[PDB]
Amino acid sequence: GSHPFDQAVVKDPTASYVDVKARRTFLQSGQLDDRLKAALPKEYDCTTEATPNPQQGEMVIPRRYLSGNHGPVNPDYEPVVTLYRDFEKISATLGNLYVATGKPVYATCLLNMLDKWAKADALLNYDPKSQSWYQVEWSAATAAFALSTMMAEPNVDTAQRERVVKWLNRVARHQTSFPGGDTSCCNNASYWRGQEATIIGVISKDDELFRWGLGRYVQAMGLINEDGSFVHEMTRHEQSLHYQNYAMLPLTMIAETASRQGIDLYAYKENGRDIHSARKFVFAAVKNPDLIKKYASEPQDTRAFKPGRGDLNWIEYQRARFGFADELGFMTVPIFDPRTGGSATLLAYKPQG
Ligand SMILES: O=C(O)C1=C[C@H](O)[C@H](O)[C@H](O[C@H]2[C@H](O)[C@H](O)[C@H](O[C@H]3[C@H](O)[C@H](O)[C@H](O[C@H]4[C@H](O)[C@H](O)[C@H](O)O[C@@H]4C(=O)O)O[C@@H]3C(=O)O)O[C@H]2C(=O)O)O1
């Protein structure tokens, strides 16, 4: 105790969440199929782009849900989070472009945007009890994934990169210093904090942050029912199946990131249950939503289970690694999700001969 990875260290702050050089090499030389071609991001002059300015002062974000933790969405929510969504989108896009092209211009463009946010002490001042707490985990991790691919890049302002790295480290330490509630301590939100702590711990060579991140994956494995369902996600009523899938996203990224540091989280299990059990459940429940009735009576919102949904990004990473079948036939168009490092089609998908 208190968990099996409590002595783990960051070996290589530049290792990112994929083998950057190997993948770029593959993208520039390999035998690409139609879907990988479709995933190639389009080059543009990012030096002339206007990027979102950070909120000055207090980060104030309305609750997502009108009431409780499900049902109709709050009308005031989306107009406010849009700024953050633009920030994430741009960040992930520039990260993906750097991987694909190796052009330092994309790295410099990312750093200038992040420097601007860092200067303003963004993602630091907020009520931990508000929606803002969640927004921080999503945006900070998104920026960190993109930055992680360019930690080895020599043609940038190294002082700027450092300044930006330090900033994200402060963000993550502050954000993860709050235990959360009865649910948020231990549900998908916990796992999102885990991915944030893991990737930021890597790039800032912060072993303590890294370990805390790995710990969240461990916590999750002990919260899987025998059918493979996550305990806390099965209480979300009509969003139950949605949140079961949603949990897969950061858990996968923690695993992928840790694998670059020589740790095999996928192999970790608790009572013979592992992340594979959870995958099987998602696939099985999408086919047969009577599986969910055991937990929730409302018909399930299945908006996430459509080709092209960001929500499926975790499948690209897992399938590349384990070679399982696309049972649902969702892996047709490319997938892009800033919050899990952009396009996992671009970064992980291997055409099968
Ligand atoms: O990927 C797409 O192609 C896509 C297309 C759509 O046009 C639209 O852009 C869509 O937006 C997605 C996307 O993931 C976006 O970030 C947002 O994600 C949601 C999640 O789906 C959850 O609802 C999440 O959960 C928490 C909730 O925020 C609140 O904190 C509550 O108390 O706890 C929840 C929990 O995590 O336990 O919130 C994010 C969000 O960013 O608000 O919306 C989805 C979408 O389907 O609309 O993607």
Side-chain angles (χ1 to χ4, degrees):
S2 185
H3 77 79
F5 303 105
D6 56 30
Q7 240 57 63
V9 300
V10 179
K11 316 261 279 299
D12 185 358
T14 69
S16 192
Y17 59 103
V18 288
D19 192 324
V20 170
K21 308 247 191 175
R23 182 69 184 181
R24 182 185 292 138
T25 289
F26 175 76
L27 293 171
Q28 288 177 343
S29 82
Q31 196 175 67
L32 281 19
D33 62 16
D34 282 343
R35 129 179 243 269
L36 212 18
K37 266 187 260 240
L40 300 182
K42 80 111 178 171
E43 296 210 58
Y44 75 104
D45 186 10
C46 58
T47 60
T48 61
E49 176 175 39
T51 59
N53 297 313
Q55 295 201 236
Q56 299 286 345
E58 193 93 342
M59 202 179 152
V60 170
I61 296 171
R63 68 213 189 269
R64 170 165 221 277
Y65 289 107
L66 251 210
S67 89
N69 63 14
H70 66 106
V73 168
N74 184 4
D76 302 309
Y77 180 69
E78 197 184 353
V80 184
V81 290
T82 299
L83 178 85
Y84 295 93
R85 289 166 185 199
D86 283 357
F87 175 84
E88 293 167 8
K89 172 157 182 162
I90 290 164
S91 275
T93 292
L94 290 164
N96 288 188
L97 277 160
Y98 180 78
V99 173
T101 68
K103 291 177 187 190
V105 68
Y106 297 119
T108 296
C109 285
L110 177 67
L111 286 175
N112 286 325
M113 184 168 73
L114 301 189
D115 200 17
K116 170 166 65 173
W117 282 56
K119 279 193 202 311
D121 277 320
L123 301 183
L124 284 166
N125 306 121
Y126 55 88
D127 180 347
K129 292 289 162 192
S130 71
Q131 185 58 36
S132 299
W133 192 48
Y134 300 101
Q135 189 56 67
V136 171
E137 82 205 6
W138 296 326
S139 296
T142 301
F145 279 130
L147 185 50
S148 81
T149 65
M150 55 194 59
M151 295 296 303
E153 178 52 60
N155 285 31
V156 299
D157 182 338
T158 62
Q160 190 178 46
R161 185 168 59 200
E162 197 162 298
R163 183 159 64 241
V164 162
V165 169
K166 282 187 178 128
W167 167 67
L168 291 168
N169 178 278
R170 319 223 272 97
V171 172
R173 302 217 97 155
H174 185 68
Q175 208 272 340
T176 65
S177 73
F178 304 101
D182 253 23
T183 302
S184 62
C185 63
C186 317
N187 72 345
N188 78 270
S190 172
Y191 321 149
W192 285 102
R193 298 203 290 288
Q195 79 154 18
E196 166 197 33
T198 304
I199 191 60
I200 293 183
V202 163
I203 63 173
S204 64
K205 193 127 186 5
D206 187 322
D207 296 323
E208 278 288 277
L209 210 46
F210 186 57
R211 290 164 189 161
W212 191 94
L214 304 174
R216 310 323 278 186
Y217 186 97
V218 164
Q219 183 197 47
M221 300 293 107
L223 285 166
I224 301 172
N225 293 323
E226 124 148 351
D227 56 4
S229 61
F230 289 113
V231 166
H232 297 295
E233 316 311 319
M234 289 301 102
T235 69
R236 308 297 298 269
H237 297 273
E238 86 283 354
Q239 300 298 310
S240 283
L241 178 55
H242 178 85
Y243 280 116
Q244 169 84 19
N245 180 82
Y246 202 59
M248 301 302 286
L249 287 156
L251 289 178
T252 300
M253 302 315 289
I254 299 170
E256 291 298 308
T257 304
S259 92
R260 307 278 306 147
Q261 302 298 325
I263 295 166
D264 183 5
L265 283 187
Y266 285 113
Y268 185 86
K269 46 187 103 60
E270 290 252 349
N271 358 97
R273 325 242 222 7
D274 52 20
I275 200 169
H276 302 288
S277 311
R279 175 179 75 253
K280 292 162 171 30
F281 185 73
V282 177
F283 288 0
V286 160
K287 268 122 75 136
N288 180 31
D290 297 331
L291 291 187
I292 301 298
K293 269 146 174 48
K294 166 164 128 173
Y295 298 108
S297 47
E298 305 87 339
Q300 298 300 296
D301 192 333
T302 57
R303 74 195 192 268
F305 310 102
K306 260 194 278 73
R309 283 293 297 217
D311 305 74
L312 307 175
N313 211 36
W314 65 270
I315 301 176
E316 296 282 34
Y317 297 106
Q318 288 205 10
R319 186 179 49 157
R321 189 174 289 274
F322 297 110
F324 53 73
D326 180 18
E327 306 178 43
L328 304 338
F330 281 158
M331 314 309 288
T332 54
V333 305
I335 297 130
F336 181 78
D337 172 37
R339 288 160 185 195
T340 50
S343 175
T345 303
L346 178 62
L347 299 172
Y349 168 72
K350 310 188 173 258
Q352 295 283 110

